[PDB]
Amino acid sequence: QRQDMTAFFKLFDDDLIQDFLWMDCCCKIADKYLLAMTFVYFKRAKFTISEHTRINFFIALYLANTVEEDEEETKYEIFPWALGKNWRKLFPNFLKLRDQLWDRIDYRAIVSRRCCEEVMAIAPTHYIWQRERS
């Protein structure tokens, strides 16, 4: 458990982040569960308060999609938001950042359903937890 869970949520006060969710209507890359997994990755990677950058959020989200989502193309829409509109030649670098985050969590990228529920239970009425998929 933690009390200091908003170490994660102040990402969802950021302007471009809140718009990024708005782009993702039906939660195809930012599902409620994927947003839970990205937090799991954060504490498995032992992130300090300094390291909660949005670029770290995006490489974490991309990793979650890599593990849990079979459709490989959808997660590519993260590249623009995370790199700019020169992302077409910057995303190899992005993917390499993912490989060290995956390295940093000692390759333990699998997150159980029940473990997602645990982080969703600390403050379950936050608006990112009502990003259900139908």
Partner: protein, 288 residues
């Protein structure tokens, strides 16, 4: 590090060398991105949490900036090179029954840990010199614990692909893995692949020919599947004297439940262990 002794194989996954003896697997990076493949990530992330005597053991992971080596326990040969070598002499029933038993245990361990293998081909099952067979190559494997995920229909070589996927139905799990072993079960007895199709539509027709063309009394929702068409030729079912002769009738029984059309009434892994086909189960050593 240590020294490579010989190159075992080379595919799209990467290159496996033989290098204490370990299996040294170099993973081939992406062309555009220089980054680790999604499959490689899944395989390692899964094998880092799966510890079982009937599952290949991940020993180490060497990450560098342009390279990525995976150290596995070494097993002497796969099941298919073994089945080919026994193609004339035959495979003794006690060893068949031993192998299938072990395979089901490793599989039940995965399914109870909410993991799909999604590639249960003979070539992905490694055997050693003391009668053990283990699951390997978890590149197309995934966890299914998390709700409403996206799944695909690229999963396994047609020969061992369940009909539920061929008919293009979405939302499938574990049942498809059992189907694959069912195919391997038969292929261990008759020594030749059960449904050797060259395309997806052909694969279905080989299955229909052997197991009969599906009804809605055998498969309740078969005719409202995305890739079903009424054009399908209706064949009668052959039974397992004419299909797999050396099998006794507890053997044919387990096999029929492994090849059940309806995924919901298809036999599971933990349950298959408790079949009357495993009372005389021992652990014989094989001939390599």
């Amino acid at each position: 590090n240590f020294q490579k002794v010989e190159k075992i194989g080379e595919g799209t996954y990467g290159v496996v060398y033989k290098a204490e003896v370990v299996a040294l697997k170099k993973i081939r990076l992406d062309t555009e991105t220089e980054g680790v493949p999604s499959t490689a990530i899944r395989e390692i992330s899964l094998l880092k949490e799966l510890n079982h005597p009937n599952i290949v053991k991940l020993l180490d992971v060497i990450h560098t900036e342009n390279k990525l080596y995976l150290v596995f326990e070494f097993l002497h040969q796969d099941l298919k090179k073994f089945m080919d070598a026994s193609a004339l002499t035959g495979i003794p029933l006690p060893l068949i029954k031993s192998y299938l038993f072990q395979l089901l245990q490793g599989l039940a361990f995965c399914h109870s840990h909410r993991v799909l293998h999604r590639d249960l081909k003979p070539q992905n099952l490694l055997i050693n010199t003391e009668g053990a067979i283990k699951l390997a190559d978890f590149g197309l494997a995934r966890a299914f614990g998390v709700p409403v995920r996206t799944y695909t229909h690229e999963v396994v070589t047609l020969w061992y692909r369940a009909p539920e996927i061929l008919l293009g139905c979405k939302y499938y799990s574990t049942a498809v893995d059992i189907w694959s072993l069912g195919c391997i079960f038969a292929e261990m007895v008759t020594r030749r692949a059960l449904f050797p199709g060259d395309s997806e539509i052909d694969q279905l027709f080989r299955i229909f020919r052997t197991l009969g063309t599906p009804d809605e009394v055998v498969w309740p929702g078969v005719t409202s599947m995305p890739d079903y068409k009424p054009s399908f030729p209706k064949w009668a079912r052959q039974d397992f004297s004419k299909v797999v002769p050396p099998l006794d009738e507890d053997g044919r029984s387990l096999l029929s439940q492994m090849l059940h059309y309806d995924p919901n009434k298809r036999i599971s892994a933990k349950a298959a262990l408790a079949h009357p086909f495993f009372q005389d189960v021992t652990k014989p050593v094989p001939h390599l």
